[PDB]
Amino acid sequence: MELVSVAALAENRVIGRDGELPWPSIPADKKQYRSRVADDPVVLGRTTFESMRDDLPGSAQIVMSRSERSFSVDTAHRAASVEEAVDIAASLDAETAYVIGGAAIYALFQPHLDRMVLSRVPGEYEGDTYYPEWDAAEWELDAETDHEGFTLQEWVRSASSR
C-alpha cells in the first residue's frame, strides 16, 4: 500500500498534456511505465480516462473528477481529494498505487507521494501542461537506469524534519 508518481518528460517540463500521451516509435518508456503499472491499482485524471475506455492499464481504475460520476466498468472508482484515493489504496491491499497525470492531479498529490518514478525522454518532443510546485533540492535519488531513448530516475525524498 505505498504511493509513487509516474510521469514522462519531452525536454519541455511536461507531466502528461492534460490527458494524452500520443508519441509512438518509443515502446521502452512504455516498458518501465508498464512494469510498475502491470496488474495493480492506477491513480489518474478524468481527461486520460476518455482515452482509457478500451483497455485498463492495471487491476483497479482510480479516476480524479471535479463532477463526481458513477462510471460502469469492472473495478473502477472515482476520487475527490488526497483522503478519497488513500482509503481505497488501504482497502485494496496491493504493493503500491501510482499517480499518472495530468498537471492538477500531480499538484494536490506530491505532498503525499513518498517515492517518484519519471521516464525522461531525450530528443525533439512536444509539450502543453507544466510541473507545478515540486521539490528541487529536497527530493533525494535512489537509482538511475540509462537507455537509447529514456532515462528512468527512482527517487526517495529528503526524509528529514519528522
Curated annotation (Swiss-Prot):
Pathway: Cofactor biosynthesis; tetrahydrofolate biosynthesis; 5,6,7,8-tetrahydrofolate from 7,8-dihydrofolate: step 1/1. Its EC number is 1.5.1.3. NADP(+) binds at residues 8, 14-20, 47-48, 67-68, 101-108. Substrate binds at residue 29. It comes from the Archaea. GO terms for biological process: dihydrofolate metabolic process; folic acid metabolic process; one-carbon metabolic process; tetrahydrofolate biosynthetic process. It is an enzyme of class 1 (oxidoreductase). It catalyses: (6S)-5,6,7,8-tetrahydrofolate + NADP(+) = 7,8-dihydrofolate + NADPH + H(+). Residues 2-162 form the DHFR domain. The keyword Oxidoreductase applies. Activity unstable at KCl and NaCl concentrations lower than 2 M and activity increases with increasing concentrations of KCl or NaCl. InterPro entries: DHFR, DHFR-like_dom_sf, DHFR_CS, DHFR_dom. SUPFAM superfamilies: Dihydrofolate reductase-like. GO terms for molecular function: dihydrofolate reductase activity; NADP binding. Key enzyme in folate metabolism. Catalyzes an essential reaction for de novo glycine and purine synthesis, and for DNA precursor synthesis. Belongs to the dihydrofolate reductase family. This is Dihydrofolate reductase HdrA. It comes from Haloferax volcanii (strain ATCC 29605 / DSM 3757 / JCM 8879 / NBRC 14742 / NCIMB 2012 / VKM B-1768 / DS2) (Halobacterium volcanii). The lineage of its organism: Archaea, Methanobacteriati, Methanobacteriota, Stenosarchaea group, Halobacteria.
